[PDB]
Amino acid sequence: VASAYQRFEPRAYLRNNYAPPRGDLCNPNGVGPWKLRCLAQTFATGEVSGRTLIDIGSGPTVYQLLSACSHFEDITMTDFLEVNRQELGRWLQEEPGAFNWSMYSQHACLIEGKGECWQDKERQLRARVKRVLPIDVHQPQPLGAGSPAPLPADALVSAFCLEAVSPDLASFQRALDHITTLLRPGGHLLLIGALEESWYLAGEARLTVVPVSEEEVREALVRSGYKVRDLRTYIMPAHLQTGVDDVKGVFFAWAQKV
Numbered sequence: 001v002a003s004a005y006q007r008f009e010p011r012a013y014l015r016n017n018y019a020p021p022r023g024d025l026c027n028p029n030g031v032g033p034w035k036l037r038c039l040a041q042t043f044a045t046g047e048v049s050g051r052t053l054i055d056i057g058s059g060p061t062v063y064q065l066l067s068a069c070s071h072f073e074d075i076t077m078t079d080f081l082e083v084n085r086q087e088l089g090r091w092l093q094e095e096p097g098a099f100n101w102s103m104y105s106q107h108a109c110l111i112e113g114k115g116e117c118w119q120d121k122e123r124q125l126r127a128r129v130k131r132v133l134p135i136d137v138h139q140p141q142p143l144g145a146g147s148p149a150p151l152p153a154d155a156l157v158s159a160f161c162l163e164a165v166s167p168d169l170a171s172f173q174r175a176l177d178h179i180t181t182l183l184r185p186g187g188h189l190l191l192i193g194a195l196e197e198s199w200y201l202a203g204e205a206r207l208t209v210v211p212v213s214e215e216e217v218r219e220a221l222v223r224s225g226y227k228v229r230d231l232r233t234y235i236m237p238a239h240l241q242t243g244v245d246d247v248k249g250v251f252f253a254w255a256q257k258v
């Protein structure tokens, strides 16, 4: 896969998945509103807290941390590709060419209902993201030997990574076992991913993906030593079925390392 990922174009990836129609946040039935709503509700339970958090395979996106950032003062973002870490850098440092996530920040504020202005939410994320490190979930030690990242983390977040870098279920299970080592016992894992997908595009790159089911993800979490606190499925409607992939749904898993 690492080979195919050498052609991965962040801008194309962003455009394919986070720009209209999939990125439209006005229609309450879209995947965008559904996902932000499920990230906000999880953190609103007050049960997912601590000091440090690590986002596994962040790619060029930050939406997965909008609701999470107000609960963890030290946040580590990561990704296998340097081009993605650079794309993140552009938004974090507010440099030219950064992707504009303002509609997402605003919706997270809208959903959270704490009366927070979106600039303050983005300010807080930028402030708490202490570093952006390389990572490889295929390695028993994903971050490596002496990573600047505070370990073990009190919580992990990973969206669309594992199944997208695993050729099969068994390999999926190992990557999960792998990243699980980065988590403090009793800690929390918020895993988001593509259901029954076999490929997706990112510019000249065409990636192979392992198609997994909700049941398969649940059992994998259980086998890695987690207690599944919540599991949800969003079925991808026809209007969101574009030619960028063959994903059937999106899953969300809130797991607790026991």
Ligand SMILES: Nc1ncnc2c1ncn2[C@@H]1O[C@H](CSCC[C@H](N)C(=O)O)[C@@H](O)[C@H]1O
Residues within 6 Å of the ligand: 001, 002, 005, 008, 056, 057, 058, 059, 060, 061, 064, 079, 080, 081, 084, 135, 136, 137, 138, 158, 159, 160, 161, 164, 165
């Ligand atoms: N071996 C590996 N270990 C960890 N991440 C990897 C990887 N190989 C590829 N990746 C990264 O996994 C990501 C899958 S796309 C998901 C991006 C983002 N988390 C989102 O929610 O959209 C890409 O950023 C890709 O570079």
Ligand SMILES: O=S(=O)(Nc1ccc(Cl)cc1)c1ccc2c(c1)CN[C@@H](CO)C2
Residues within 6 Å of the ligand: 017, 018, 022, 023, 031, 032, 033, 035, 036, 063, 160, 164, 194, 197, 199, 200, 209, 240, 245, 247, 250
């Ligand atoms: O759900 S999405 O259609 N877009 C989306 C997700 C979250 C929000 Cl907040 C908004 C839009 C979405 C986002 C990323 C990926 C997909 C779908 C499916 N392919 C994966 C890579 O395998 C990558």
